[PDB]
């Protein structure tokens, strides 16, 4: 763990962030309605768009289509071609805020999680048709993520203090995880490797929890953040967990011992979002930062 500072820049509050898989680019989506795509090696903006006047809380690359997809508090999903800058689709996806967007790794599917208490599946090869609504949660759906080892299933994290895991094509959850994080679930992520059936959740109750999704048990609890924990993720290649919080810090936890290894206060106020490519990137109140670990 030699943490090197690749590229930071100040901006309005960064609510979403994503790495491009083949280009050295980071996408940020801002509370001001702007999105930015930065080449973090050369430190030049590849493209910027004033998408709306409302916060844009969710954004992802869809690399195989040369798109970004974003979702904003104006209720709308929009898709832009990052090479030409042109908007390719623009539709009202939910009658409320869009918190989270996930892209299926091999099929033309996108999920959106909303304050309307639902997750919705859209198919871009079927004219962006609504293919299914997953109803069940009792509060805002804050995060949605496919299972990378089985993307026919996905998890939703919700302020109703639960995580629900669903199968595409089925109306009810495969199971519902009672987190015990009584201030709600802000984020949910899968561990990517096949040796552990692990998921991780972050909460305003200052805890981070690891879950065995076969037995539905809590494997460990990571404590130490001083304020709401906005996200927690497994690193794809390093045996570490990365979290960020409104206490202004990133924390890197040992993924074997579940103990904190490093606490980074990057000086940009509250942390809100995370991406991993050993690059990681995080979005904050006052900008973003791209960090190399090895």
């Amino acid at each position: 763990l030699d943490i090197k500072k690749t590229f930071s820049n100040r901006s309005d509050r960064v609510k979403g962030i994503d790495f491009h898989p083949t280009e050295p680019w980071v996408l940020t989506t801002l509370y001001s309605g702007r999105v930015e795509i930065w080449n973090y090696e050369t430190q030049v903006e590849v493209r910027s768009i004033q998408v709306t006047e409302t916060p844009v809380r969710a954004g992802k690359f869809i690399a195989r289509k040369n798109w970004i997809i974003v979702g904003s508090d104006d209720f709308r999903i929009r898709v832009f071609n990052y090479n030409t800058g042109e908007k390719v689709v623009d539709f009202e996806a939910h009658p409320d805020y869009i918190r989270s967007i996930a892209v299926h790794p091999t099929k033309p599917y996108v999920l959106s999680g909303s304050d309307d208490l639902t997750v919705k599946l859209w198919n871009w090869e079927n004219n962006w048709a609504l293919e299914q609504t997953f109803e069940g949660h009792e509060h805002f759906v804050m995060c949605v993520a496919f299972n990378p080892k089985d993307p026919s299933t996905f998890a939703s994290g919700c302020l109703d203090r639960t995580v629900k895991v669903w199968s595409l094509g089925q109306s009810t959850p495969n199971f519902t995880l009672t987190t015990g994080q009584e201030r709600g679930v802000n984020y949910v992520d899968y561990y990517p490797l096949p040796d552990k059936p692990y998921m991780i959740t972050a909460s305003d109750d200052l805890t981070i929890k690891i879950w065995d999704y076969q037995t539905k048990s809590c494997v460990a609890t990571l404590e130490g953040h001083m304020s709401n924990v906005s996200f927690a993720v497994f690193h794809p290649t390093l045996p570490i967990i990365i979290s960020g919080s409104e206490d202004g810090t990133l924390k890197i936890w040992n993924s074997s011992t579940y103990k904190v290894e490093k606490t980074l206060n990057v000086g940009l106020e509250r942390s809100w979002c995370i991406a991993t490519h050993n690059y990681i990137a995080s979005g904050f109140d006052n900008g973003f930062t791209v960090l190399s670990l090895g």
């Binding site: 509370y31 918190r99 304050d115 509060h139 805002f140 302020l159 802000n186 509250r270």
Partner: peptide, 5 residues
């Protein structure tokens, strides 16, 4: 609302 920031 709840999580507006």
């Amino acid at each position: 609302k709840e999580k507006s920031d």
